[PDB]
Design a protein around this ligand. Sequence first.
Ligand SMILES: [Zn+2]
Ligand SMILES: [Zn+2]
Ligand SMILES: [Zn+2]
Ligand SMILES: [Zn+2]
Ligand SMILES: [Zn+2]
Ligand SMILES: [Zn+2]
Lengths: 219, 219, 219, 219, 219, 219
Amino acid sequence: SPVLLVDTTDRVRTLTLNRPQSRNALSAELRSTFFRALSDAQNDDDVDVVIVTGADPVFCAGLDLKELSPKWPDMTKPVIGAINGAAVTGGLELALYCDILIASENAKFADTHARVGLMPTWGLSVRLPQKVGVGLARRMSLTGDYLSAQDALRAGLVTEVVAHDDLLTAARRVAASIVGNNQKAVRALLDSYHRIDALQTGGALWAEAEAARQWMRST
Amino acid sequence: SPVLLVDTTDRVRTLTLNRPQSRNALSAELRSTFFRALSDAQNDDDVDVVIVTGADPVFCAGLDLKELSPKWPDMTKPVIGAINGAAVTGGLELALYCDILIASENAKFADTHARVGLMPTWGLSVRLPQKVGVGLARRMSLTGDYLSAQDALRAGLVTEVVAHDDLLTAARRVAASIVGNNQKAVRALLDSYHRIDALQTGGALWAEAEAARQWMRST
Amino acid sequence: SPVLLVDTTDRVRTLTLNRPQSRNALSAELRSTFFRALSDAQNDDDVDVVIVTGADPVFCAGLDLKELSPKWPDMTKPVIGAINGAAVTGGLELALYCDILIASENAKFADTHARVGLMPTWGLSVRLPQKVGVGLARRMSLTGDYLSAQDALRAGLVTEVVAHDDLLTAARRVAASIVGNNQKAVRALLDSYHRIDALQTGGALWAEAEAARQWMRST
Amino acid sequence: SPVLLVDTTDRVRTLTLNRPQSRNALSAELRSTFFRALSDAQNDDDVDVVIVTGADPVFCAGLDLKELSPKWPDMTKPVIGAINGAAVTGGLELALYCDILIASENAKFADTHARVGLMPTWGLSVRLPQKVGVGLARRMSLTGDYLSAQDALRAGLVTEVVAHDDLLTAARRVAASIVGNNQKAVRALLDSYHRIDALQTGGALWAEAEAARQWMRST
Amino acid sequence: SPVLLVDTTDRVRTLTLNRPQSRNALSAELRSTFFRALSDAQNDDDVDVVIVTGADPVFCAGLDLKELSPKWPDMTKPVIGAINGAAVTGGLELALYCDILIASENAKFADTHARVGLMPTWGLSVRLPQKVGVGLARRMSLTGDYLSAQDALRAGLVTEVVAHDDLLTAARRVAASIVGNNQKAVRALLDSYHRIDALQTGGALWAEAEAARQWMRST
Amino acid sequence: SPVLLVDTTDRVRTLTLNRPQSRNALSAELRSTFFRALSDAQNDDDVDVVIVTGADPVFCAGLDLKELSPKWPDMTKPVIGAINGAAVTGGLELALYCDILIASENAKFADTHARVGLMPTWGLSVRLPQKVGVGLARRMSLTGDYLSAQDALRAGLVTEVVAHDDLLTAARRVAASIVGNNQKAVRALLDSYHRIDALQTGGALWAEAEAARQWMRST
Ligand SMILES: [Zn+2]
Ligand SMILES: [Zn+2]
Ligand SMILES: [Zn+2]
Ligand SMILES: [Zn+2]
Ligand SMILES: [Zn+2]
Ligand SMILES: [Zn+2]
């Protein structure tokens, strides 16, 4: 089957990471396909909103390390992450790129970069404190322990936690609310939020990149 | 009756938005009167603390669109928003300007800018992510849906949620605690918090203003 | 007895503020000793993680005012604050320096700078809004009221609240999880988080310092 | 005659401010026409480079005060200012918007905002120190005195000073060099320079706007 | 004689550093007196403009090291430095605080911090690259060599170089031009320039302060 | 012969780019060797100061395009660029990394990125406006024309221009002045200048990197 499933219904495009046999690990092929699908959704006049999710039971375990710069494209259409299970390391970075997250009761979040001896290059060290808080981000990154869905909700990492079998139902509800609004305005306002975020995070992203380069050279 | 009610008791000045027949919409007259009242409170040696609230049952529905730059003045005296009902769009921006918010169980918060085809110019796109979190701000702005008082408390937008008939009781308790402190120090510390906030948000506020101008020109 | 107790067990160094007769107030001697102990822990190859706590029942009441620039050193080893009781003013600033906080059910947090007519110089006005939110930080600083452990957890100031007699048990669990990871990577990632934080907070820290100097001169 | 002359030769569009009877003062009509012409040049596939100049003997004396937000559009095509005479106040702000300036021996530059009791809103207080240096910008703004073409060259405000009758010859030489390069790359690189500049100047531009608003309200 | 001479003529207050027997070194007394005189000038309605100069033949050799935080106050009135001779180390920092510099042909500028084993705490490491350029600032600081008046003019550190016996004549000319303008506007515009500068330099000033503290502790 | 010549005399290490047959183009081998030599100089207690120069008659023509992230290491020892001839594109970026530049009368500087259809990734778009001014940087990048040594001196890109046969004589004079100072202080002060620069430029460097990635993907 394809590594990425694509559905478009009611102006909402759902992109489902589809390597469950490998915990939806981001192989070179899946990365290429996923990032291209985001760009294609942005360019497709039939699409107002994107949902990103994973084939059960894991959302995304991270980069395919067996097999082994940022790639997530500039978008003005909203991206909703429907986190169905574990979102780990590069998969947590994928979740952190989304505009809005909704979680299954089964979702959990972890950063194992330190454990596997890697430094983050897709924004974890910038966006995790931004979205879960400074102390909790540090606790996650230094322990490698899982953060539960309920704790993710308490911390602000996700907007909503629902029963597992209601996850895509819930994501479709949020998408439908967006679809009902003025799309020119939705896109203008989201572009602006993105520009403000880029202004506030770029120095940090450079610092993250520099720390990764220094790690690779020393290691 | 006047569009703005003013009371001063125990060194606390309460400013009550008073156009309930129009959901306390910010007409030109109410904007002028309100912003002047803030400045007058700052200049009045009989006042230590301001409470802003609305005539029931709505806090503020936003700019008077039927009738139709930032105006909130530099202040060193604390402003407590006692949110008694819906705070929508420009009214949510008014709430976001306050130093400290307390909510009735009946309070709710929404951003309808996208729905009505307007871009924010009173800081919503900067202060909403700052005070409710990135994902929740994006969810609010893109859906236009209401955020409940309890969810506002969970997210950090408000400090306290109380029964409706205890709202101004609660706001007076917080004000009285402030009044009991060293007012020179209260003002020096709040001025400093404001200066730090201005330093951290100005680039973003410029970006918001630029996005609004680009919207007006394109639209 | 010494003003600072030191234990090293399982590569974790616990530094216990030990002036309970004075609410663990930071005398000149305790400040010197504590800040030196942090540096010594950083330099000691037998130590991976630091826990900071207080002799019961107070964590730290602040600077010793009876007796009466920032001193907390650059560190790449994680510092866990185990807050056992009240953390007030300079003691709240000590808590705010920690990477990760865990609280006893008995912990409480307050800022009395305004009440005692002092401006903060150890980062309270920068780190309190960063870690508890803008409105709650302003409410704390202007009222001087205590924030409970449960409210600190809701707000994101602490990562976990436990029964009092489980506090150091809990802190040791988090420390042990860190100790089990790749220490080169733990330190590289924490150094990076610190560098990103320094980049984002330095302007604010300057503003805080300038406001303190202006207060001292005017007062 | 039209208030703005337009020529397109060798893929270079020259926009000549054409109200010499009024020192090329920026009336409402000329502002509208000029800013629209910039946008039209950006959108016109027949144009690679813009030259802005004035009908002799003045470049631009500023806003038409007799008759009486920023409007200069986002552009990726280079704009060369050929300063033929005095560039004063709003006219100095027009010069400061250009990517590259070349001056006649007759060019001179002045800021009279203070003298006429106005605050700048088109970036003078940000871009003048950026392009002529801090001390010289302050000297200009506080004295209102003219800066000569030679002193403008020494300071870095202009790239080249030529005999008056060679001014547009010189501007065409620079334009032709640009036209000979890879235009996709020229535009990508200039867009990037503009984005970097926007990141570095936005906070300052907000501060300038806030100071102007405070002036208007106080005055 | 007094350590600081004061004259007020034509609404211009000249403050002359007056310890020529000690190369106008900034003793505790002279620092106190000078910084107070700046504040007094700001508060004195008889004064529009300040000139700072030194008793010949040295402007200021720096802190009085024999005898041995920033103190220069917030001002909205312009300060013109008339540099009559050598401006070294702390004296170069005094020059760097001025809004506008004019130099005698005899002026020269040097940074000897490294040579004497001190780190700067009055902004040299921020303002020297800002006002003379990155490479030249680094060359000055690392060599300790003098920068001539002509080279200071070329680099942008000073606005004008005049014969020695014309120095205060020249400074009075610039002051008189300022005095002829709208003083409300002069002050509003200079306050704004100062606020923009503070926004852009505060992070750097914190970094300078932190580097000095780290030097003192290591040394 | 080796691609990089190394000499150490009087505590000064001269690194001479040595592929004159290829205009000192930065092949993979020369990049590796050069960047390693910088790190080795930093680590070598026999070295206080580095001079970088090229085998005549070209300084560095840029990346070896025939053959075809930033690599310049963190250093606290000063690096003096002695620019002996043309410094083009990547070679101009090498020059821009140096702390202090001195030029031969034969030096010239150019940016051909646009001409060859490449975006800069070694800081040209950040450091060129920083060191030569905004307008001149834009003129250089968009024209591809050479900047002369004298114009480089006028603009602030270099500190000194000397006869060609005096170039390394001059560089040794500056190095010797540095060597005569307190080396602990030289390094502490330069580290601080570098940290301040990193704070001020990181956001811009991220933006440059993002623009390059977007170019590679579109192209
Ligand atoms: Zn990663
Ligand atoms: Zn609005
Ligand atoms: Zn304190
Ligand atoms: Zn203007
Ligand atoms: Zn100094
Ligand atoms: Zn390059």
